[PDB]
Design an enzyme around this catalytic site. Structure first.
Site, mmCIF file in Angstrom:
data_model
loop_
_atom_site.group_PDB
_atom_site.id
_atom_site.type_symbol
_atom_site.label_atom_id
_atom_site.label_comp_id
_atom_site.label_asym_id
_atom_site.label_seq_id
_atom_site.Cartn_x
_atom_site.Cartn_y
_atom_site.Cartn_z
ATOM 1 N N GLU B 58 1.163 -3.246 -43.644
ATOM 2 C CA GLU B 58 0.873 -3.142 -45.140
ATOM 3 C C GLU B 58 0.770 -1.544 -45.940
ATOM 4 O OE1 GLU B 58 -2.602 -3.786 -47.732
ATOM 5 O OE2 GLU B 58 -1.848 -4.879 -48.683
ATOM 6 N N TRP B 80 1.483 -10.958 -49.191
ATOM 7 C CA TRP B 80 1.478 -10.989 -50.221
ATOM 8 C C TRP B 80 2.392 -12.023 -51.264
ATOM 9 C CZ3 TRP B 80 -0.027 -8.123 -53.712
ATOM 10 C CH2 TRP B 80 -1.525 -6.849 -53.307
ATOM 11 N N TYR B 94 -0.604 -0.874 -55.754
ATOM 12 C CA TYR B 94 -0.911 -0.309 -54.835
ATOM 13 C C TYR B 94 0.101 1.201 -54.778
ATOM 14 C CZ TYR B 94 -4.488 -2.905 -54.730
ATOM 15 O OH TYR B 94 -5.503 -4.297 -54.404
ATOM 16 N N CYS B 146 -7.706 -4.425 -55.775
ATOM 17 C CA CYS B 146 -9.069 -4.654 -55.855
ATOM 18 C C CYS B 146 -9.443 -3.747 -54.901
ATOM 19 C CB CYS B 146 -9.108 -5.572 -54.333
ATOM 20 S SG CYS B 146 -8.533 -8.184 -54.997
ATOM 21 N N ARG B 166 -13.518 -3.192 -55.772
ATOM 22 C CA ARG B 166 -14.185 -4.599 -57.460
ATOM 23 C C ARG B 166 -14.490 -5.433 -57.046
ATOM 24 N NH1 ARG B 166 -10.579 -8.013 -59.214
ATOM 25 N NH2 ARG B 166 -8.981 -7.171 -59.145
ATOM 26 N N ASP B 169 -13.344 -10.860 -50.563
ATOM 27 C CA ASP B 169 -13.395 -11.995 -50.617
ATOM 28 C C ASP B 169 -13.588 -11.701 -48.915
ATOM 29 O OD1 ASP B 169 -12.547 -14.055 -48.784
ATOM 30 O OD2 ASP B 169 -10.625 -14.886 -50.170
HETATM 31 C C1 LIG Z 1 -6.685 -7.768 -47.712
HETATM 32 C C2 LIG Z 1 -5.799 -7.922 -47.805
HETATM 33 C C3 LIG Z 1 -4.783 -7.893 -47.548
HETATM 34 N N1 LIG Z 1 -4.281 -9.159 -48.092
HETATM 35 C C4 LIG Z 1 -4.366 -10.520 -47.918
HETATM 36 C C5 LIG Z 1 -4.340 -10.120 -46.320
HETATM 37 C C6 LIG Z 1 -5.133 -10.999 -45.905
HETATM 38 C C7 LIG Z 1 -4.621 -12.608 -45.936
HETATM 39 C C8 LIG Z 1 -4.199 -13.952 -45.254
HETATM 40 O O1 LIG Z 1 -4.174 -15.106 -45.310
HETATM 41 N N2 LIG Z 1 -4.558 -13.956 -44.107
HETATM 42 C C9 LIG Z 1 -4.660 -14.355 -43.293
HETATM 43 C C10 LIG Z 1 -4.062 -14.150 -42.571
HETATM 44 C C11 LIG Z 1 -3.646 -12.845 -41.754
HETATM 45 C C12 LIG Z 1 -2.084 -13.076 -40.755
HETATM 46 O O2 LIG Z 1 -1.003 -12.736 -41.572
HETATM 47 N N3 LIG Z 1 -1.540 -14.089 -40.294
HETATM 48 C C13 LIG Z 1 -0.406 -14.545 -40.061
HETATM 49 C C14 LIG Z 1 -0.459 -16.045 -39.793
HETATM 50 C C15 LIG Z 1 1.319 -16.145 -39.653
HETATM 51 C C16 LIG Z 1 1.798 -16.827 -40.990
HETATM 52 O O3 LIG Z 1 1.494 -17.528 -41.523
HETATM 53 O O4 LIG Z 1 2.553 -15.953 -41.040
HETATM 54 C C17 LIG Z 1 0.528 -14.125 -38.191
HETATM 55 O O5 LIG Z 1 -0.984 -13.767 -37.484
HETATM 56 O O6 LIG Z 1 0.869 -13.452 -38.040
HETATM 57 C C18 LIG Z 1 -5.810 -14.404 -41.967
HETATM 58 O O7 LIG Z 1 -6.119 -12.972 -41.719
HETATM 59 O O8 LIG Z 1 -6.397 -15.565 -41.360
HETATM 60 C C19 LIG Z 1 -4.243 -12.480 -47.422
HETATM 61 C C20 LIG Z 1 -3.900 -11.012 -48.319
HETATM 62 C C21 LIG Z 1 -4.425 -8.740 -49.795
HETATM 63 C C22 LIG Z 1 -2.812 -9.256 -50.612
HETATM 64 C C23 LIG Z 1 -2.467 -10.368 -51.747
HETATM 65 C C24 LIG Z 1 -4.217 -10.562 -51.530
HETATM 66 C C25 LIG Z 1 -4.610 -11.687 -52.273
HETATM 67 C C26 LIG Z 1 -5.753 -12.082 -51.646
HETATM 68 N N4 LIG Z 1 -6.724 -13.624 -52.303
HETATM 69 C C27 LIG Z 1 -7.685 -14.341 -51.915
HETATM 70 C C28 LIG Z 1 -8.322 -15.124 -52.618
HETATM 71 O O9 LIG Z 1 -9.003 -15.855 -51.694
HETATM 72 N N5 LIG Z 1 -8.658 -13.199 -51.088
HETATM 73 C C29 LIG Z 1 -7.576 -12.239 -50.378
HETATM 74 O O10 LIG Z 1 -8.422 -11.959 -49.393
HETATM 75 C C30 LIG Z 1 -6.705 -11.659 -50.705
HETATM 76 C C31 LIG Z 1 -5.965 -11.017 -50.094
HETATM 77 C C32 LIG Z 1 -4.955 -10.911 -50.623
HETATM 78 O O1 LIG Z 2 -7.729 -6.037 -51.240
HETATM 79 C C1 LIG Z 2 -7.584 -7.081 -51.707
HETATM 80 C C2 LIG Z 2 -7.481 -7.995 -53.062
HETATM 81 C C3 LIG Z 2 -8.293 -8.444 -53.683
HETATM 82 N N1 LIG Z 2 -9.342 -9.134 -52.520
HETATM 83 C C4 LIG Z 2 -9.133 -10.418 -52.810
HETATM 84 C C5 LIG Z 2 -10.828 -10.696 -54.051
HETATM 85 C C6 LIG Z 2 -10.801 -11.722 -54.848
HETATM 86 O O2 LIG Z 2 -11.065 -13.047 -53.843
HETATM 87 C C7 LIG Z 2 -8.850 -12.152 -54.949
HETATM 88 C C8 LIG Z 2 -8.452 -11.465 -56.168
HETATM 89 O O3 LIG Z 2 -8.706 -11.723 -57.507
HETATM 90 P P1 LIG Z 2 -9.204 -11.208 -58.985
HETATM 91 O O4 LIG Z 2 -10.568 -10.512 -58.322
HETATM 92 O O5 LIG Z 2 -8.278 -10.346 -59.548
HETATM 93 O O6 LIG Z 2 -10.484 -12.750 -59.167
HETATM 94 O O7 LIG Z 2 -8.373 -11.072 -53.856
HETATM 95 C C9 LIG Z 2 -9.798 -8.887 -51.266
HETATM 96 O O8 LIG Z 2 -11.029 -9.421 -50.901
HETATM 97 N N2 LIG Z 2 -8.930 -7.294 -51.102
#
Ligand SMILES: C#CCN(c1ccc(C(=O)N[C@@H](CCC(=O)N[C@H](CCC(=O)O)C(=O)O)C(=O)O)cc1)[C@H]1CCc2cc3[nH]c(CO)nc(=O)c3cc21
Ligand SMILES: O=C1CCN([C@H]2C[C@H](O)[C@@H](COP(=O)(O)O)O2)C(=O)N1
Ligand SMILES: C#CCN(c1ccc(C(=O)N[C@@H](CCC(=O)N[C@H](CCC(=O)O)C(=O)O)C(=O)O)cc1)[C@H]1CCc2cc3[nH]c(CO)nc(=O)c3cc21
Ligand SMILES: O=c1ccn([C@H]2C[C@H](O)[C@@H](COP(=O)(O)O)O2)c(=O)[nH]1
Ligand SMILES: [Mg+2]
Ligand SMILES: [Mg+2]
Lengths: 264, 264
Positions: B58, B80, B94, B146, B166, B169
């Site tokens: 990322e 994503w 970003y 975020c 800001r 999670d």
């Molecule tokens: C900080 C950061 C980067 N992001 C993430 C990062 C991890 C995740 C995630 O779901 N992580 C899981 C899976 C991590 C992962 O890539 N697992 C695969 C699992 C296999 C697969 O499903 O591909 C692997 O180990 O290969 C975990 O850490 O247990 C989701 C968004 C951003 C992108 C947009 C986003 C929306 C988000 N929304 C929310 C609301 O709950 N929370 C976030 O933390 C959040 C974080 C993010």
């Molecule tokens: O890099 C990131 C991306 C965003 N988030 C989480 C925070 C929030 O729980 C969610 C974004 O939701 P909203 O705040 O816009 O309503 O994703 C996070 O924790 N790290």
């Protein structure tokens, strides 16, 4: 105030000596956070007298979207004088970004109006944000925004605000910065029928200037007085309709003012 | 990590039950700061196994100004997926802000390049800043930024960085956010011939989703292990020339991974 003096002491105890844009030299730490429960009182530094009238007029001025100092001069406020050009202009600093952030379209975003609407309509939102850090306009500004980015938060019917301040002159700037944002929170809370919560102050480069050291040692020897109370004497129709006369600070019992030069 | 678990435990203890964008429900606090000395070890959470592959990809993707998940898909990084449109686009999130912040000019400011230039040429600057918070682009983004605003600082040969996040999670995102910026600091430090200093994490709306509560109790029951060590295998010609293979993590001995669903 206790957190302020603690911060001052920390900069003395843990700061590194570090040169600066201005020429003067500082002791500096990086990263700090303090919290002021606005229910405990209005956080106006009591260990020296602060120029509240300058603080109030400056915020009213921001809120009008004004970046010409004519208004401050009309009200005998001089804190912005060093950076104004011949016409009294500072370029698109805080006021302009707050009320009219410019975009390619020839369009303008009123971040203050937006934040008010979020507070009224969607207080749980996690993006109730104002930024003055308009990257595309920085070089037009007489000075880069210091109180750069702030966020509001609502819980239990109380409005909280966190400021990210990239650079902080602890002796001169910070008391103004704290009171200015504390005042904005009260105003916004009034307009949104909320109670006041916390003002959270977060600093980047947080420093004492080498030629504020006598002043700082003097202030540190002083005991904080009880916080004053902010009274707003009426409810203007909007966040933009306030006037200096609307505010009274009650029970402000400070120690004497301490003179210190601004590093230009 | 101690400070991470401490935060998690703080949210559980002091957090306000609050509704949110996704309709999941949260425990929330506002305003928190943590400091990681990157000399002590790479701050990659050990109380559960974290997917450093996804964090590195990322980050490389950010640095390329890329806003299409196509590159992420190619390396099986799926974080994503939930937010892209059909053509894989996330809008000007970003990467676009970091590399090509559009101005009202037909101009594009490359903040990452400006920061490197500042670090190499004006390291005492108190405005070494990248902002993703481009107010005029927010409506076109798939997700509001975020990790919104970050600032560098140089003292004693060491590069520190403060992130203003800001919204956070704590269970899912925070561990990635911490590691991502720690990795960025290492890359920046390397490209500026500096050592690594502190990563200071500052949070706005810092929360635990109601449906990560079982996961959180599991994690809180586990003892942190020693931090791992980041190895960068070579030194690329620039901050933009890094490859996923450049990075090794040594001595990472996490407790087992803990599954949790994201709030879309
Ligand atoms: C900080 C950061 C980067 N992001 C993430 C990062 C991890 C995740 C995630 O779901 N992580 C899981 C899976 C991590 C992962 O890539 N697992 C695969 C699992 C296999 C697969 O499903 O591909 C692997 O180990 O290969 C975990 O850490 O247990 C989701 C968004 C951003 C992108 C947009 C986003 C929306 C988000 N929304 C929310 C609301 O709950 N929370 C976030 O933390 C959040 C974080 C993010
Ligand atoms: O890099 C990131 C991306 C965003 N988030 C989480 C925070 C929030 O729980 C969610 C974004 O939701 P909203 O705040 O816009 O309503 O994703 C996070 O924790 N790290
Ligand atoms: C935070 C904030 C608001 N600002 C201030 C605020 C206060 C001051 C200041 O000089 N305060 C002094 C003088 C306040 C003042 O104007 N007092 C009037 C006038 C007295 C006089 O003329 O000296 C009076 O006592 O009647 C003080 O707090 O004792 C300067 C700039 C901004 C304007 C741009 C600026 C540049 C700044 N530069 C520097 C580098 O030293 N530090 C700042 O804190 C600083 C703060 C500011
Ligand atoms: O609202 C403000 C504006 C400025 N400063 C201080 C911090 C620095 O000492 C100086 C600005 O210098 P630079 O960070 O831009 O170099 O003024 C504040 O403390 N508060
Ligand atoms: Mg003056
Ligand atoms: Mg996934």
């Amino acid at each position: 105030m206790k957190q302020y003096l603690e911060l001052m002491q920390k900069v003395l105890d843990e700061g590194t000596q570090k040169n600066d844009r201005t020429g003067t030299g500082t002791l500096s730490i990086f990263g700090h956070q303090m919290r002021f429960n606005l229910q405990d009182g209005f956080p106006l530094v009591t260990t020296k007298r602060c120029h509240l009238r300058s603080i109030i007029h400056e915020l009213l001025w921001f809120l009008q979207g004004d970046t010409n100092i004519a208004y401050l001069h009309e009200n005998n406020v001089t804190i912005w004088d060093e950076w104004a050009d011949e016409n009294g202009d500072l370029g698109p600093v805080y006021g302009k970004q707050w009320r009219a952030w410019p975009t390619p379209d020839g369009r303008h975003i009123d971040q203050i109006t937006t934040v008010l609407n979020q507070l009224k309509n969607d207080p749980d939102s996690r993006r109730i944000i104002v930024s003055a850090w308009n990257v595309g306009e920085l070089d037009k500004m007489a000075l880069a925004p210091c109180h750069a980015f702030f966020q509001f938060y609502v819980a239990d019917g109380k409005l909280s605000c966190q400021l990210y301040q990239r650079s902080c002159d602890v002796f001169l700037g910070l008391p103004f910065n704290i009171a200015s944002y504390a005042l904005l929170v009260h105003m916004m809370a009034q307009q949104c029928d909320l109670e006041v919560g916390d003002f959270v102050w977060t600093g980047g480069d947080t420093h004492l200037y080498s030629n504020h050291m006598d002043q700082t040692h003097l202030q540190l020897s002083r005991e904080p007085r009880p916080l004053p109370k902010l009274i707003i004497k009426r409810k203007p129709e909007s966040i933009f309709d306030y006037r200096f006369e609307d505010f009274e600070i009650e029970g402000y019992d400070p120690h004497p003012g301490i003179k210190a030069p601004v590093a230009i």
